[model samples]
Target: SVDLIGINVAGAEFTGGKLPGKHGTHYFFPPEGYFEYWSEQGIHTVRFPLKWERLQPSLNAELDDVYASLVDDMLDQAKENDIKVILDVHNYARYRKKVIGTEDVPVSAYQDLMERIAKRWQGHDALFAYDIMNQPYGSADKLWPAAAQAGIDGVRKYDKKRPLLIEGASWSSAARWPRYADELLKLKDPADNMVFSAHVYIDEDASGSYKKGPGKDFEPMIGVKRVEPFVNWLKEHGKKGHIGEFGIPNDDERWLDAMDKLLAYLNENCIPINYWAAGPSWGNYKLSIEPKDGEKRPQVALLKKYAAKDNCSDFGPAKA
Candidate 1:
């Protein structure tokens, strides 16, 4: 059944291409309430986004403790809010434009990064899992499986209890799992605690950018259809599955209908999904579930309605 549910809290990843961008100007963590607000909505998890270069500006180097402190504060606050976090390195399989599994940044470099992260942040109440890397892309298909397995080993070396997540390559397009990530079935974890995450976008391109009109891809069950393959893949492999990212623009109420249908299917399968997203920096981004002037986004109503109640309590208000 669904063990985690919530939205992607993205801020540290803003202007991601800026490479060690200026804080506040290009990238920064959101103010308080990013977690508290969602916890109030009856969800139990948040996909906490982070930047790699910012944390480890150099390869095989110690994480910048100052940058790391931000995560410490966020984790404590998430713990206070009674929700867990999926720490996501929102770099798409590249470090400063150098792809993983290459000399510029060999697979071990990523393993080293995961090692430092597990050593630094594991054993915290708020940490649910370590997302190896978000939407890894731009690498040979075979290379990702190798990096994925290494990440598992890296985290396990330090923390044995916490689960880790790995998304398929090609930006982890939900419908394309078999074509791009078929080899990921070979991945193994010492803790036997690993989750397969994929991003589902209902749009024609499945990009989640929603820049194009709902277009010809719009259908009553398009959400379910797009995600079914990923779901089936999980069951066949008997592995835990998650939709780390999925969302639609409120500009069209029809999008909400598709979202509702999708959540219902996930509910039946007991798969968790974190909407993309609810964060401090989204501003007027249409897909954001962050409330404006205390008003909930259309997506939140459906999300709260489908939030996992397994081993949890009813939604409750949080302290300011």
Candidate 2:
């Protein structure tokens, strides 16, 4: 059975931003009462995304203390709330504007980055999994299994106990899993614990780009039918996976209904899924689940309906 019902906390990984008491880096932190809000709503995990460059300024060098400290603080907060965290490297397979699989920054360098991160947080109780990279694309497609395999190898160097998350090429799309599933499934790790991650969106393009139209006039582009292939693949391989990101326009009933069917399917199959986001930085996002005017958005109720029904307090820390 799945173990996490989560949401993405975005913004700190963004390159630039400006908020009160912050300047220069434009990095934004979660609001003071952020995790508390989710804890109250029964959300038990958070997929925390951050950038590689910020964590490690130079290739193969020590992780920047300042950024590392911020991550540490976040993990501590999650621990306090009994929420597990999937530390996401949101670089999409790049560092300092250089793409992985290229001479300028080979796949090994990416592995080195993960190695450092794994060693740092391997002991933390709040650490759920190391999300290798977010939506790897571009030259990474050509490199294929080797690029992802290198990352798995790096993480296993210092920490062989924690589960690692590997995303597929072409934006981690559920529709594109077949393009890399065979190779991805063959990826080796000393611990032999890995979870495949996929992102699903119900737009015509299946890209999470569509917005709500007036009333219930629009039809969903994709539905449970679109994701069956990926889900069936996991069942066939005797594997468990997570839907790392999925969302719909908040005010659209059509999309909401479609989302309801999708979530039901996911829950029935015991697939852990995290909503797209619930972060302060997503200002006015059509699908933002973050509270507004001190009140939880409508999506929160929907989320609570399918959130991991388990009472986290009854469970102990995850086994290594």
Candidate 3:
């Protein structure tokens, strides 16, 4: 049983080799160095991103031992330290460099990846939990549910008891929660342990439409405020809601104040939440922000505030 107050300690940046592989800079799973790092921070659960490009590069029913071994090592170390690991099969083929937003790869690609993951992690209890997909944004409306279910079904084939994590599409916005609520509510497979995942970022202004009016902006601010309705609907449907990912701008007070309010509400509702990252910068905001230097950023501080070693909630009852 794992009460997930997870922070994304991404392995994709290192495995994908998008950035120069800074060996000792951040905690790369199975690196041996990350073990102490996690323990020192008093951190327990981590959302590990296992990218498809690195794990299974082709459609030819093959798997990479090196990557699999890395995953094994990571889980092994996490177990030793009493830290839990969430295996997030970060299937991003839909957002490959050749493509942009909304366009996805062949549906078969997603299915293949899911099946492979299920076969690999079958019956593994050391693995904290599993996420069906990462932030799957801008996908075709009709294809999204099927794509999500394919991964869920794949996981069920092997481990019928592990909790299955699901993220909302449209870049993990709360607005998309309703679209899949009915389907999610019906997932009584017991093994499915369906938890709705939604990502929140307070800094980036993706849509140039903040000027458009309060309701029409493309920013997460509006969507973050919209989480209540989503949660209410989930409770109404007899399902639990989890904030798959959420972070405030490290230095920005405006964002921090906003997020504090959000966090309080989430805590009050007993929603499980995870931070965007544990590293210096998460996508856009640097991990260390002003006044706090390297140690105290508004975002990290806030995360630490609510992260009380699951004293408030236990992961056992929620276990599948």
Candidate 4:
């Protein structure tokens, strides 16, 4: 399978060009150029959100018309451009509202969703892997061998061979990485094809050891340092780990410097990376290389450069 070094384009943006699933509503963008732009920049994978609500309007129902059409169009577009797609079952709201920390969704509903998704995309080449859920956690372990097997069973029902990408609990944090890893190995399926995803927003100031707080506040070396252990651990495990989501606050120098260091390390280690988003909002954490307005920012330029880089390193201790 092709490695994922890309960005998250919410389904709305990929299909009809509207900011459909998240952020603001009714904000429309032209979809035609976005994928091509990424491809031209050497991005091999694109994680596109497919919300359960959008995919199945009714509880436990089949994929809806709108979502199916959207997926078909997205897959077609990515295939034409030679980009592999990660069909993320972006089920954020379903369990988030009702369940507390690390709680698994009701097995019946969860299984239903997985089954539908697997059946839909089985045997598709343009599709690289299935991210069972985006940032899954709610009263349970990061990797549920039972759940993984169930998910694998669902996928095997139709598409049996694609690698599965699973995230850890505690919001896919490295601190909780081991929990998932232990459970992950229990699955009957071979582990070589699996990829683990980690989401990071390391807080620097929270510890008071650094002047700049988390990357959220500024581009601090402190923030990147926070993620070092996680990266190192992933490498040591002989598993491929991708930064499923990361971005510095708008133009924060501390955050930028820290991110630059982290990026360099990721390049050196050959770790795959994917930015949080591509649209703009109040804080404007959207990690798109394309500049918003006419003004250009250094961080944007840095991202554009890496996005265009052909080879990347994946090495060293996690970062402590």
Worst 10-residue lDDT window for candidate 4 reads: 11-20
- CA lDDT scores, all candidates in order: 0.80, 0.75, 0.59, 0.59
What global local distance difference test value does model 4 have?
A: 0.59
Tell me the tens digit of each residue's lDDT in model 4 across 21-80: 432343222255557876776666877666665666554677777557757767777888
Q: Give each model a TM-score.
A: 0.92, 0.89, 0.77, 0.76
Residues 1-320, candidate 2, lDDT per residue (tens digit)? 23646798887776522212231247766655678878887887889888787788788889988778888888888888877898999877776666787888888898899889989999999998888889877766667567788899888998888778888887887777776778776787779788888888887677786743534444543557666767777877767677888887766667777777777777666667778877767767777788776444666777787774543321112222
lDDT of 1 by residue, 207-291 (tens): 8778877766568799989888888877776676788999888878778889988888877676778889887877888787877
Give the number of colliding residue pairs in candidate 1: 0
Task: Summing lDDT over every window of 10 consecutive residues in candidate 3, give the lowest-scoring window.
Answer: 206-215
On a 0 to 100 scale, what is the lDDT of residue 112 in model 3?
69
Question: Which regions in candidate 2 have their CA more than 4 angstroms from the true location?
Answer: 1-4, 16-25, 211-221, 294-296, 308-320
Return the clash pairs for model 2, or none: 17-26
User: Which runs of model 3 end up more than 4 angstroms from their true locations?
Assistant: 13-30, 92-109, 123-125, 179-192, 204-224, 280-295, 309-320
Name the TM-score of candidate 4: 0.76
Sort every candidate by TM-score, greatest first: 1, 2, 3, 4
Candidate 3 overall lDDT versus native: 0.59
